[PDB]
Symmetry: C3
C-alpha cells in the first residue's frame, strides 16, 4: 500500500492563504501535499493533506461570499481536487482534478450559513478522505445566531477516523484504528492541531468558570457517525449544520452523520476538566476524547 | 444457504396493481416472489421480493386513505407478509403471514403524511428484509408542503444493503457487501430501477439548470444508517420522515436511521453531473452513489 | 478476562434509596456491585452494576432539583463512579472514583428536562459501561409537555448492548453479541427488568385499545446508535432528549445517538401484539425486540 513516489516524502506544512478581494468575494489558495503526522504516540501516518494538516486548515467566510479557490497540487504522482459542502457548484466542472505539479482555480458561492465539510473529491473518494483530505469551512450567518450575545468563548472541533495505511480493504470493510478530535484556530492564540489521540488531552482547550462556550463541530468521517457529548454539561442550544433555523435546546448529545456539522453551546459552571467525547465509546476508547480545562481565570 | 425449492426459480416481475375504490379507499395487490436481480456487474442475487423488484414497487396514496392490501405469495415454500410503516394496524392480526400459493387481504388506514418504509414482517424479519423484501410507500399530505410551489422536479430514491446470499450469520454480524441506491417512478417516463451498484451511474437521473429538485428518500437498511448528501448543493428544505412539520433548512447532509425517510429539496445551479451519496464513504465505495445529470434543457 | 476477586461474586440486588429533602433537593444513594444477570437464555454475564440491575435503577427528579448523590462501592477491587448526563457538574471533582468498600457523596443540579443517560465514569469508561454500568435519569419538565393531557399510559424503555465478557478487544473492535431492551418502573405495578433478549417478549408491556402511549427511551450504547420504531403505529409526537422544545410529529422511526434519549408518543388502535424494535435489524435479531400487548381492557 506504499506508493513508490511517496517513499521518504514529507512536505513541510504551508500556511493557508486567504484574502478578501471584494465585499462578497474571497480568494483562497491551498495545497495538496504529502505530510507525516503523528496520529497516536509512536504512530506516523504519511497523510494525504491540504496544506500539511489533517484535517486541513480552517476556512471562514461570510454568508454570500463567492470563493475563488486555487489548489496547488504538490503530490508528485496522485491528482487531487476540492469539494466544499458550503458551495453551489457543478461537481463535474468545479470539483475536478488538479494534476501533480499543477494548479487549478474554481469559483463558486457560499450562500448558506453553517459548519460544512470540505474534502478531496478525486476517485476513489474514500481513499482520498481516509488518507487525510478533509476539513471544515464555516460560513458565518449574515444575521448571526439568536444566542450570539450569550456566548463567551468559542472553538472549532473536528472528528475523523484513521485506518490502516492507504489500505482500501480496511477503508471499506474494517473498523477504524483510531478516532480523533482536532481543533482549528478561529482567533490568534487558539490551538491549531491535527487529528490525533492525545494533543487535546495533554493540552486541553481553556475556558473560565461560568462561561457559555460555543463549539463549531463537524464529523468528517470518512465512515462513522458521531454521538457528540460534553461531560458535565448539557447543550443549551444546538443549531444543526450551523443553520440558525435548525434550533434544538437542552440536548445531552448531538447525533452527527458523516460530514454532519453543528453549532453547540453549553455552560461550564464549576472549575475542573471536562471531557469532550463521541459517546460511541469504542471510538472514544480509540482516541476520540478531547479535554476542556475550566479555571477561575480562563488562563 | 440455498433453499432446494428456490433452485432455478426466477419468477418474472409482475406489475403492482392499484386502484382507487372510494374517496378515501384504495386497493393494492402485490406478490411475494423469487427473482434474480443483478446487484453488481456479474453478480446475481436470487432475491426475495415484492413483485420481482428489490426494493419493491413504489406505492403512493393520500393522507387519510384506507388501504385494502392483498399479498399473493408465489414463493413455493416460504411464507411472507407485509408491514407498511405508514399505517395504524394490529401487527399480530394485520401483518400476518400468507402461505405459499395463497393470498391474504388486510385493511388499514394511512393517516400520517410522509415517506415510509414497507417490508416483509415474517420471522426472522432480518432475513426477509436482507433478501430484498423492502420498499417505500409515500403518503401525500392533504395540505401539501409549504415549499411545493418552488419544486420543479421530483424523484424517489431508496437506499439498501446487500449481504452474502441468504447468510444469516453475515446478515447479523458482517459488513454489507454492497450498498446501493434505486429510483422508483412517480410519473410516466421516470426511471424505475432496482438496488444495484451501477444503473443510476450509467443512466443518471435528469434535470435542468436552475431547477429546484425534490427527492423523496428512504434508507431501508436492513442494518445501516445513511448520511444522505447531494454533491454540489445544499438542501434548502428538509422534512424529516416527509412530515411537513419536521422542517429543517440549509442542511448539507441528512442523517437517516434504518427505515428513516425524508423529503429533501435543493437547487442545481450549473450544468454538470452531481453525485448523490451516502457520506459514509465505505458504503459509497461499495455502490451507494447515484448521479444527477443537469443540462441546459433537462433532456 | 476474569478478575480473580470477582470469581464466584454475586452480590444480591439492593433497592435504590431516594428521598426528597427540600422543595428543590433530593437524596439518592446507589451501590456499585457485581451481579450475575441472565442476558440471554442460558447466558450469565457477571455484570458491573448499579444496585444489581443492568441497566441500573430508574431515577426520576424534577427540573430544578439538586441531587445529593451517594455511591457505595461494594466491588471488592475495582473503583467506580457516577456521571449523570442530567447535571451540571465538574467532572474532575464531582464524577470521581469511589474506592472499594468506600462511599462518596457529590452534589449537583438537574436544571434541564429530559431523558438522560447515567453511567460509571471510571477509566476506561468503555469497560465500565460495557460491563453494565449504565442507566437513565428522567428530569420532569416544570411545565410538562404540550401533549400531556393526551397520554393514557407510559413506560420507560432502555436499549443497551452486551459483548464478550469483560473483553476490551471485543468492546472496541467487535460487533455486539446481544442488543436488548429493558423497562424500568415509573409507577407501582410497572415491570422492572434488566437488559436481556427475552423478558419483554415473554412478558409484554400492557396497554388498552385506543390508548395513547408515552415511552421515555434512551439508547445507552455503549457503541451503537438506535433506529427506534414501534410496529403498527407512527409516533404522533416526539421530543428529542425529552426536552419539550425539540418537538417532531409523525415520525416512523426515531434516530438515537449513543446516550440519546427521547419522549415518544403513539396511539394503538387495534387489539394485538405490537413489536418494539431497533430497525437496525441485525441488532433486532440479536435481541432488541420488546412487545406491547394491547387488549380490550389493558389487563
Ligand atoms: Cu453587498
Ligand atoms: Cu478572483
Ligand atoms: Cu486527493
Ligand atoms: Cu462530500
Ligand atoms: Cu466504529
Ligand atoms: Cu457568560
Ligand atoms: Cu372525504
Ligand atoms: Cu376493498
Ligand atoms: Cu418475506
Ligand atoms: Cu419496520
Ligand atoms: Cu457499514
Ligand atoms: Cu425553479
Ligand atoms: Cu421553589
Ligand atoms: Cu443533602
Ligand atoms: Cu465502574
Ligand atoms: Cu456520558
Ligand atoms: Cu451493530
Ligand atoms: Cu386516550
Ligand atoms: Na440566509
Ligand atoms: Na395531517
Ligand atoms: Na425549563
Amino acid at each position: 500500500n506504499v506508493i513508490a513516489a511517496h517513499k521518504g516524502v514529507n512536505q513541510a506544512p504551508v500556511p493557508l492563504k486567504m484574502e478578501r478581494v471584494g465585499p462578497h468575494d474571497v480568494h483562497i489558495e491551498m495545497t495538496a501535499q504529502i505530510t507525516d503526522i503523528e496520529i497516536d504516540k509512536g504512530k506516523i501516518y504519511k497523510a494525504w493533506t491540504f496544506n500539511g494538516q489533517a484535517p486541513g486548515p480552517l476556512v471562514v467566510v461570510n454568508e454570500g461570499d463567492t470563493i475563488h479557490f486555487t489548489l496547488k497540487n504538490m503530490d508528485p504522482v496522485v491528482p487531487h481536487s476540492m469539494d466544499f459542502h458550503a458551495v453551489h457548484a457543478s461537481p463535474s466542472k468545479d470539483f475536478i482534478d488538479v494534476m501533480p505539479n499543477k494548479s487549478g482555480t474554481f469559483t463558486y458561492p457560499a450562500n448558506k450559513p453553517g459548519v460544512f465539510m470540505y474534502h478531496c473529491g478525486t476517485k476513489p473518494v474514500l481513499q482520498h478522505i481516509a488518507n487525510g483530505m478533509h476539513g471544515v469551512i464555516i460560513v458565518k450567518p449574515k444575521n448571526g445566531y439568536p444566542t450570539d450575545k450569550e456566548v463567551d468563548r468559542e472553538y472549532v472541533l473536528i472528528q475523523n477516523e484513521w485506518y490502516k495505511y492507504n489500505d482500501m480493504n480496511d477503508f471499506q470493510n474494517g473498523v477504524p484504528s483510531y478516532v480523533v478530535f482536532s481543533s482549528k484556530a478561529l482567533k490568534p492564540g487558539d490551538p491549531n492541531t491535527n487529528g490525533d489521540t492525545f494533543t487535546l488531552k495533554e493540552k486541553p482547550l481553556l475556558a473560565k468558570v461560568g462561561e457559555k462556550i460555543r463549539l463549531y463541530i463537524n464529523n468528517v468521517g470518512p465512515n462513522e457517525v458521531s454521538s457528540f457529548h460534553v461531560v458535565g454539561t448539557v447543550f443549551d442550544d444546538v443549531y444543526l449544520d450551523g443553520n440558525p433555523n435548525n434550533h434544538l435546546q437542552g440536548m445531552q448529545t448531538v447525533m452527527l452523520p458523516a460530514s454532519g456539522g453543528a453549532v453547540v453551546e453549553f455552560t461550564v459552571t464549576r472549575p475542573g476538566t471536562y471531557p469532550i467525547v463521541t459517546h460511541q465509546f469504542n471510538h472514544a476508547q480509540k482516541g476520540a476524547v478531547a479535554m476542556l480545562k475550566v479555571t477561575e481565570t480562563g488562563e
